Structures are given as structure tokens and as C-alpha cells.
């Protein structure tokens, strides 16, 4: 039964069970939030008082009818959120007076269309439109987006699109990021043609692409702005690849493809037209696949029908998709590949030995095999010798057996991430060449390791009673060595760390006894710059940058 | 046992200084070359003498004249070629395997070795009757190695093997298996072959050699060790065994070899109770995984174990199988294993320990139609109960469920087999506990040890009326009085119920985040 507020002017009337817009509103209010109530009705005078309001958040209340002129006096309002209400239909009158509006979210309302009069023509300041719904938004007409020339974010949620009039999205000159939700492919070809010259990033959501057929577009030779293409929750078949790949012929400038929580009801039996395979995926440098569900993942094909298509790509991500082998021939065909991220898969040295064959991944500089099932650092590093250009490896989140004294690694490996790796000792396995080492979140009792070049040394969340000798790394730049078991570090330790420029010590059971905590106490002060995280005194909570001693 | 171990001591003679009444002496792995009487005369009490891995050329059994008590002599891995014909009657274990004997050194006097139980031999030539002198002893192991053996003038060599519990045969470790000796056996409990290298060209050579050691009186076990073989040949090896009297078949350190194609096979009535494969290296990378996995899936035995391999999956049997035991330890299996598999309705115990099972709720949907499942060990995987779709469909029949050592959170109690009796959830990540721990009232053992639990909602362990074991240790319990009372009154009222990280009664086991004080010590008024 209470509306609050704050000094700035940010009133918060959230889940107080209202049946009407809170009585008495002030011209001091800059941001009103009346979400999640039963404001079934907004009336003529309900919002005349707060004429200086920049933000009106009415999300998911119970709003089913809003008088036409409800918003007339809100002429400074830039953020309007009516999502998730029972607006059975929309009025052209609500938005006319809001010449200051930048953001307007209308999704979540049971309207069938956007009504018979353009809603947005007089909104020269609009940057973000969100319309549509899951179960009833069914038509898209050419009037619907008249008067809109540019938008940062357009989000049409049209899962139930029964009909899309030709050329609806074409009048819009520039769209920075269009998010479409279609349940099936019936209109994708038609809409894709309308956004060839406007959209800069297309995100397609929740689409059954199972039986998607391509065919040449009516459109004229228009150079497309589109640089990113992303499929969120799509169902795809091996056929879909063959057709979808044909779309890139219209978006020559494209440089990134992404597939998110997508299902592939297939096995990689791709047969790409030959025109497309000569193109080598155009200007697409980066390909990203996350959580691709493949029902019979184990029956997956050679994937050799695309070995030529991908000779030019530079960054590939295939995360949490049950990858268990990148066939050697594939690897040798990924000539131009610089970044490879195979996190959260099924790689084991046995497969990795094939996937990194003698001629594999020639340009690879970064390998990421986090959260796979590796169990021997010696076997791993030795397999990877095939990678001559490898300069940074991440085999973290892999429950390794104890590393030995003698290992080999890529002679240019400057970055090794062994975090969360279960280890409890560090031997001379780790190569001297290492400029960055991350051995945090483990069971290390002592880091006692000569690594000259070593700049950074992330080694937090450990059981380290004692701090490492400052000779072990003469050119050191950083040392994240928090959440540890440090009682107190020897006075005169950052002497030969004439290089250290940032440090971590927080969350640590120390010992702030005036007779002993001399050095630390005053060094942390001289260079408060070189330091993030505030050291907690054991039992006091008082910072170590505090009181010094005579 | 009164022992002196002098192995790797670089020795040359038998240390004349040793304690006179010594009983077990090992001079293994040295450079002793001759063994004269005055070398061991004094050790009158000697029972055991291990001389494995030396350089002795001749061995005179009279040399042991004064060791009337010697029962274990191991002169394997030397360079023996000559041998006194009469071994000491005191022998129970005589090992002469891996030497340089032309022909089996078993003389007629070996009959006097009535107490003999282990016999180890090696040779390069075999005649049918060579082991006749020991055919009337109640032997337990005959170790025999054909490392020294080459093929000869086609006139097939024979060799009658005396009745033994175990027959262990070791071959040359660096070549295609090429034995043509005809080996008979009457009574055999366990045949065991080591160092088997096959392609398709010598596959049959092995099947023939096995044919006669395998002809059956009763049942016997077979063990293959270090087999590197074609896939074609492996599918043959299985088929060769199926009709034969082999109850347990075991394979250790298998290496699949040149290609994996679809091979012909049918499994008919068999004596086989158990296939067990452990440690599988695979050198083929491109092949139809059906061609490999179906060969096992369609097997009509009761127990299949396949462990420590690169395998990523197992196919669901095409027809109702008779598997009642499945153990796929330490592979790379996923939660899609046996998805909606309605053809393991006899399966009682399934073991998926040490794999890549991700989605705890997919792992529940797996057992949906496993009408006989009582034990499910999906431990040491990568499980977690954060699934978007948290729908439960457990087999109503599970009694023992090892979920220990994953990344399970607390929602894990929203979804547990109706009639569970054992629930090992140790080494997980549970703080998040729900009010569903009493809608599952039949447990007897419980292990929520090594977790992240601070407190436990008041009134759980009350309805766990059948509880009797509970591992509460290694948890960061909040011991501030307003809410640590319930657990303290509990541990005390049930002192015997709480076990430790070892297995014995211990109410101390539960400790506090701060002092380390036993939670049952605390008194909140």
C-alpha cells in the first residue's frame, strides 16, 4: 500500500498490490516503476502530475485498457515499458505526444496486429522497439513501421505469424540489431530480402528450419550491411545447412555466424552447392557454436564435405556440443585457423592425438580445451608439439594426474591456464617460456618455481601458507594470489619486484600485530595504486593499509 | 615372515653375512651367475628364495642339500639351459620360466615333487609327452613361455598339458603370434594367454591353437592379455568362443588395429556368463560406430563390462537383451547413453562411474523403462541439477544410487527414486536444500559428506524413520545458536547413526565453520 522513492527522483512502486496508479505523483519523479500490480485501468488524469518523468516501467501489471490521452503530459518520457499486459489491441493515440521517447517495449500483449493506424510515425527519437507475442501476433503490414528510418534494436516476436505483407521491413533504412522470433521458415526468405540493406545484425530465434528451402531472391544487387548472423533456438537438419549457406550469397560482408541452443537432427551429412564451396564462406572470419544438441552425436560424419569451405576462417568455437574428435584431415584444412575453443566436450589425449596431427592447425595461436576429460599433462603437451604457432593454451577444468619433472610443450607457449585443475604440487613440467601462468583454485601448498619471463601469476583460491620467493620471477607484472593461507609475508619481499604493477591479497587470514606487520602495512600505502582488493585483518576486519607502528 | 630383500643391490654372490635363521631371501634383479652349495649352506631355515632376473646358466639342485625347508624357488628370467634332474621334494613353487632351455627340463624324477603346486617352464621345442612326469600332481599353476619358440619343419609339435587349475601361456612380445604346437588339456579351470598380436593373415592360427585347449570337459575361464588385433579378427575371436565351454571371458589391454568395418556375427545359445574388457587403446579414427558398438550391444550374456576405453557411447540392444549386469567404468560416455531404451528390462545393476554424464535429469529419464534396476552408480561423472527442464521419471525400483563426486546442487532432492535405500551424495556441491527430503522416506544409508552445507531445514531427519547411516562430516556448518540447535539435539539423540570418513560411529565428525567444534557439543538454551 506504499510507494517509496529516492533523492535523485527514482520512485519504486513495485509489487505493492495496486489496483490503480498511485495517487499523488510529483513533478520530482524522474523514474516511476509500478510493475506487477493489478493496474487494470489507466485513466485520463492518472499521470498528469509526473510530467518530468523520463522512465515509466509498467511491465507485467494487469493493464487491459488505457485511455487514449493517458500519456499526453509525459513529454520528456524516454523509456516506456508496457510489456506483459492484457492490451488486447493498441491505440495510435498513446504514443503521439511522446516525442522524447527512445525506448518502447510492447511485447507480451494479446494483440493480433499493431492495429489499423501506424503507431510510430512521429517518434523521431526512437532507438529501441519491441513488439509481438508468442500466441496471437499474426500479421505484419506495410504500415506498421512507417515513419521509422533508423533503430538500434528492433525485436519482432512473431512466432504465430500467419501473414507477412511484402515489403514491411524494407522502408526502414538502418537497423543495428533485429531480433526475430519465427516458429518456422515460411516467411524467412521473404523477410530476409526486406532487410538486406538495413540490418547489421540478424538474430533469428526458435525457428523450425527443418525443411527450409532456398531459392534466388527477387531483390536487386544491393550491398548488405549485415555483419553478424545468429541462430538461437533453431531446429536444423543436414538439409538446412545446404540451403542456409545459400543465404550468405546476399550478405557478402558477413563476418560472424553463431548457433546457440540449437538442435541438429542430422549427422553432418552436408552437401554444399559448389558455387558456395569456392566462396570459402566469404568474409566470415568467426564461427561460433554453443550447446548444439545432436541426438545421435556418436554417429556423426567425417564432416569432410566442408573441409574446403572453411580454409579461410580464423576463429572457431564449438562449446558443449559433445565434440569427441576433430578428424586430422579437417585439422589440416583449417589452414587459417588462429583461435580454437573446444570447451566442455569429450576430447581425450587419444582423440587429441589425431586432431593435432603433424600438419594440423598451422596458424593456431590459441587452443582452448577447458573442461574436457584430459588426465595427463605430459601426454597432452607432447601431442601438441605439432602446433608450431601455438602461443597460448588453456587446459583448465581438467582433473589432471600429478605432473612430472620432465614434459615438452610448444616452444612458443607463453600462456598456460591450469586453473581449477585439481593439482596439489607444481613441478618443472611447466615450461620456462611461460609469461602467464594461472594455477588458481587448486590444492597447491607451495609454488617454488623458476620462471624468468613470468609476468602474470594468477594463483588464488589455494592452500598456500607461505608466499612465493620474489626471485622466481624477476620481470613480474601481476600476482593474483588471494583467497589463500597467508599469515604474514617476510618484510622486504617486494624489493626485487621492481616491476610489480598490480596485486591481489584480499580474502586472507592475516596477522595485523603492530610488532610484526611492519612492511606490508606501509608498502600497501605508498602504492595504493598497485593493488585491487582490500586485505582483511585476521579477526579485526581492519584494512592492512591502516595504522603503522613506532 | 622373516624376510631380507636384497634386490637391485647390484649383487654378485650370495651375501655370506645374512642372519642364519632367515626364512625368505630375495636376490632378485642382481648379477648372480652361479649358485654353489657353500653360497646357501648356512641358511638352514630358508623357505623362500627369489632369484628372478639374474644370469645363472646352470642350476644344480643338489646345491640346496642343507635347505631342507625350501618351498619357494624362483629362478625365472635367468639364462638357464642345464638343470639337475631331481628338484628338492620340499618344493611347492618352482619357477623356471623365461630361460634358455632347448627342451622342457622336466625330468622323470619330478614325480617325487608331490607337494608341488606352481610350475614355471620355458622351451623352444615341444613333444607330446614332455610333461608326463608331473601329470599326477595336484598343480595350481603351470606357467609356460614360448618366447624362445620358432616354427619348424611343419611336422606339428604336440604337448599334453597336465591337469592344472590355471594354465598361463606367454608368447614372444614382439611379433605376429605364430604358434603351431598342438596343446591338449584335460582338466582346466582358467586358460590365460599373454602377448597376442594378430592381423587377418594369422587370425586363424590363433583360433586353431586355442581350439584344443578349449575343447570342453566342464566350464573354464579364458583371459586374453595384451592383444593387438584387427576388428575383423576380434569379431572372429568372439564368435570362436561363443559355441565353446567358456563361462567367463576376460580381455586386458586390447588394441583395435587396422580398420573397423561391419562384420558378420550371430549370437546363439552360449555358455558365456560374462565378457569383461579393460583398458582399450583404439588406432582407427574414422569408422561407423554402429559397426563396433552393435557387436557388444547384441550380445546374449548376463554380464558385460567394458572399462578404461576411448568409447563415447553404447548402443541400445535391438531386441530385449538378457544383460542383468553392466559396468562401463572410465570411458567417455554421455547422458544420452540408453536414452529411452526399453530393451534392458532385465538389467539389475548398471555402472557408469568415471564418464561424462552431464544432465542429472537426463540420467533419470534413462532408467524410465529399466524395470529391474536396483543399483545405479553414476558417480565420478560431471552431473548437475541445474537443468532448465527438471522433470522426474526415475525407475520406481532403484534401491542403491551412487551420485557421489559430481557437481550436483540441492535440487537433487526434488527428484529421487521412490523407494531408495542407499543414497551416496558425497563430494558434491549442496547448500541449496529443499522441503522434499521427507517425501522420500525409506533410506537407511545417507552420505551428504564433503559438501557445502551450512544448515539443514528444521524437521527433516525426523521423517527419515528408516535412516541408520549418515555421513555428515566435512561440511561448513553455521554454528550460531538461533538455528544450529536442531542438528545438535539430533546428532546426540542419534549418536550411533552418524558415521565418519572411515566407517565407524562418530558424532564428532560433524564440525563448525570457525572453531572446528563438534556440532553436538553446542548447547543452545
Amino acid at each position: 500500500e506504499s510507494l517509496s522513492c529516492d533523492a535523485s527522483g527514482v520512485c519504486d512502486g513495485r509489487s505493492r498490490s495496486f489496483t490503480s496508479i498511485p495517487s499523488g505523483l510529483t513533478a520530482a519523479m524522474k523514474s516511476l516503476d509500478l510493475s506487477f500490480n493489478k493496474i487494470t485501468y489507466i485513466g485520463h488524469g492518472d499521470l498528469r502530475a509526473c510530467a518530468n518523468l523520463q522512465v515509466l516501467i509498467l511491465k507485467s501489471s494487469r493493464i487491459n485498457t488505457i485511455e487514449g490521452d493517458a500519456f499526453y503530459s509525459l513529454g520528456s518520457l524516454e523509456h516506456l515499458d508496457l510489456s506483459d499486459n492484457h492490451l488486447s489491441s493498441l491505440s495510435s493515440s498513446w504514443f503521439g505526444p511522446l516525442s522524447s521517447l527512445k525506448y518502447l517495449n510492447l511485447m507480451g500483449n494479446p494483440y493480433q496486429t499493431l492495429g489499423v493506424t501506424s503507431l510510430f510515425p512521429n517518434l523521431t527519437n526512437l532507438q529501441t522497439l519491441r513488439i509481438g507475442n508468442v500466441e496471437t501476433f499474426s500479421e505484419i503490414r506495410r504500415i506498421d513501421f512507417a515513419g521509422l528510418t533508423s533503430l538500434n534494436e528492433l525485436e519482432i516476436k512473431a512466432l504465430s505469424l500467419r501473414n507477412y505483407q511484402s515489403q514491411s521491413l524494407k522502408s526502414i533504412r538502418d537497423i543495428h540489431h533485429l531480433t526475430l522470433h519465427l516458429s518456422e521458415s515460411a516467411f524467412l526468405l521473404e523477410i530476409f530480402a526486406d532487410i538486406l540493406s538495413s540490418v547489421r545484425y540478424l538474430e533469428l530465434r526458435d525457428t523450425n528450419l527443418a525443411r527450409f528451402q532456398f531459392s534466388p531472391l527477387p531483390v536487386d544487387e544491393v550491398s548488405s550491411p549485415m555483419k553478424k548472423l545468429a541462430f538461437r533456438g533453431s531446429v536444423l537438419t543436414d538439409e538446412s545447412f545446404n540451403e542456409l549457406l545459400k543465404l550468405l550469397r546476399y550478405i557478402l560482408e558477413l563476418s560472424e555466424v553463431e548457433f546457440d541452443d540449437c538442435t541438429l537432427n542430422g549427422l553432418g551429412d552436408f552437401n554444399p552447392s559448389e558455387s558456395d564451396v569456392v566462396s570459402e564462406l566469404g568474409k566470415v572470419e568467426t564461427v561460433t557454436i554453443r550447446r548444439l544438441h545432436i541426438p545421435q552425436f556418436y554417429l556423426f560424419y567425417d564432416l569432410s564435405t566442408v573441409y574446403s569451405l572453411l580454409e579461410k576462417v580464423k576463429r572457431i568455437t564449438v562449446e558443449n556440443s559433445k565434440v569427441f574428435l576433430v578428424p586430422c584431415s579437417f585439422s589440416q584444412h583449417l589452414k587459417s585457423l588462429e583461435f580454437l575453443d573446444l570447451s566442455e566436450n569429450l576430447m581425450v589425449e587419444e582423440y587429441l592425438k589425431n586432431s593435432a596431427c603433424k600438419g594440423a592447425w598451422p596458424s593456431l595461436q590459441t587452443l582452448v580445451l577447458s573442461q574436457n576429460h584430459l588426465r595427463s599433462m605430459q601426454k597432452t603437451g607432447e601431442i601438441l608439439l605439432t602446433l608450431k604457432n601455438l602461443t597460448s593454451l588453456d587446459i583448465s577444468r581438467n582433473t589432471f594426474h600429478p605432473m612430472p619433472d620432465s614434459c615438452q610443450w610448444p616452444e612458443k607457449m607463453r600462456f598456460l591456464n591450469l586453473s581449477s585443475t585439481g593439482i596439489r604440487v607444481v613441478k618443472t613440467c611447466i615450461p620456462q617460456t611461460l609469461e602467464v601462468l594461472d594455477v588458481s583454485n587448486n590444492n597447491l601448498d607451495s609454488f617454488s618455481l623458476f620462471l624468468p619471463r613470468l609476468q602474470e601469476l594468477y594463483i588464488s583460491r589455494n592452500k598456500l601458507k607461505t608466499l612465493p620467493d620474489a626471485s622466481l620471477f624477476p620481470v613480474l607484472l601481476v600476482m593474483k594470489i588471494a583467497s589463500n593461507q597467508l599469515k604474514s609475508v617476510p618484510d622486504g619481499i617486494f624489493d626485487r619486484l621492481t616491476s610489480l604493477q598490480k596485486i591481489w591479497l584480499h580474502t586472507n587470514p592475516w596477522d595485523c600485530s603492530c610488532p610484526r606487520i611492519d612492511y606490508l602495512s606501509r608498502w600497501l600505502n605508498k602504492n595504493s595504486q598497485k593493488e585491487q582488493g582490500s586485505a582483511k585483518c585476521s579477526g579485526s576486519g581492519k584494512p592492512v593499509r591502516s595504522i603503522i607502528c613506532p | 615372515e622373516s624376510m631380507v630383500d636384497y634386490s637391485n643391490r647390484n649383487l654378485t654372490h650370495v651375501p655370506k653375512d645374512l642372519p642364519p635363521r632367515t626364512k625368505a631371501l630375495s636376490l632378485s634383479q642382481n648379477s648372480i651367475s652361479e649358485l654353489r652349495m657353500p653360497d646357501i649352506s648356512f641358511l638352514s631355515e630358508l623357505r623362500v628364495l627369489r632369484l628372478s632376473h639374474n644370469r645363472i646358466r646352470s642350476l644344480d639342485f643338489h646345491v640346496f642339500l642343507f635347505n631342507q625347508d625350501l618351498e619357494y624357488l624362483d629362478v625365472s628370467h635367468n639364462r638357464l639351459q642345464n638343470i639337475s634332474c631331481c628338484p628338492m621334494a620340499s618344493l611347492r613353487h618352482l619357477d623356471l620360466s623365461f630361460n634358455d632351455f632347448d627342451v622342457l627340463p622336466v625330468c622323470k624324477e619330478f614325480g617325487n615333487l608331490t607337494k608341488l603346486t606352481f610350475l614355471g617352464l620355458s622351451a623352444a621345442k615341444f613333444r607330446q609327452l614332455d610333461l608326463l612326469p608331473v601329470a599326477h600332481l595336484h598343480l595350481s599353476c603351470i606357467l609356460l613361455d614360448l618366447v624362445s619358440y620358432h616354427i619348424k619343419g611343419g611336422e606339428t609339435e604336440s604337448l599334453q598339458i597336465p591337469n592344472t587349475t590355471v594354465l598361463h601361456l606367454v608368447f614372444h612380445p614382439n611379433s605376429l603370434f605364430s604358434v603351431q604346437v598342438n596343446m591338449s588339456v584335460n582338466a582346466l579351470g582358467h586358460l590365460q594367454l599373454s602377448n597376442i598380436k594378430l592381423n587377418d593373415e594369422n587370425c586363424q592360427r590363433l583360433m586353431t591353437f586355442l581350439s584344443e585347449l578349449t575343447r570342453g570337459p566342464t566350464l573354464l575361464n579364458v583371459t586374453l592379455q595384451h592383444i593387438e588385433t584387427t576388428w575383423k579378427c576380434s569379431v572372429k575371436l568372439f564368435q570362436f568362443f561363443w559355441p565353446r565351454p567358456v563361462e567367463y571371458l576376460n580381455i586386458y589391454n586390447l588394441t583395435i588395429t587396422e580398420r573397423i568395418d561391419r562384420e558378420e556375427f550371430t549370437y546363439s545359445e552360449t555358455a558365456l556368463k560374462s565378457l569383461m574388457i579393460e583398458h582399450v587403446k583404439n588406432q582407427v579414427f574414422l569408422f561407423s560406430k554402429e559397426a563396433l558398438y552393435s557387436v557388444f550391444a547384441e550380445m546374449n550374456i548376463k554380464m558385460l563390462s567394458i572399462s578404461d576405453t576411448p568409447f563415447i557411447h553404447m548402443v541400445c540392444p535391438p531386441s530385449p537383451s538378457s544383460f542383468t549386469f553392466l559396468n562401463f567404468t572410465q570411458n567417455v560416455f554421455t547422458d544420452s547413453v540408453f536414452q529411452g531404451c526399453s530393451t534392458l528390462k532385465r538389467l539389475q545393476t548398471l555402472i557408469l562411474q568415471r564418464n561424462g554424464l552431464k544432465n542429472f535429469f537426463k540420467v533419470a529419464l534413462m532408467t524410465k523403462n529399466m524395470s529391474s534396476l536396483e543399483t545405479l552408480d553414476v558417480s565420478l561423472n560431471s552431473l548437475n541439477s541445474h537443468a532448465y527442464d527438471r522433470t522426474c521419471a526415475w525407475a520406481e525400483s532403484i534401491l542403491v544410487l551412487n551420485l557421489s563426486s559430481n557437481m550436483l546442487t540441492g535440487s537433487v532432492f526434488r527428484c529421487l527414486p521412490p523407494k531408495v535405500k542407499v543414497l551416496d551424495l558425497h563430494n558434491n556441491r549442496i547448500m541449496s536444500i529443499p522441503k522434499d527430503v521427507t517425501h522420500l522416506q525409506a533410506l537407511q544409508e545417507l552420505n551428504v559428506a564433503s559438501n557445502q552445507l551450512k544448515s539443514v531445514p528444521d524437521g527433516v531427519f525426523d521423517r527419515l524413520t528408516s535412516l541408520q547411516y549418515i555421513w555428515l562430516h566435512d561440511n561448513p556448518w553455521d554454528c550460531t545458536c538461533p538455528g544450529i540447535r536442531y542438528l545438535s539435539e539430533w546428532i546426540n539423540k542419534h549418536s550411533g547413526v552418524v558415521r565418519n570418513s572411515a566407517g565407524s560411529v562418530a558424532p564428532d565428525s560433524a564440525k563448525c565453520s570457525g572453531s572446528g567444534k563438534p556440532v553436538r557439543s553446542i548447547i543452545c538454551p
Binding site: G268, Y301, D302 | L286
Partner: peptide, 6 residues
């Protein structure tokens, strides 16, 4: 992985 059907 598997090769095709030739």
C-alpha cells in the same frame, strides 16, 4: 567420425 558411403 565416419566417412561417407563410397
Amino acid at each position: 567420425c565416419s566417412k561417407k558411403k563410397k
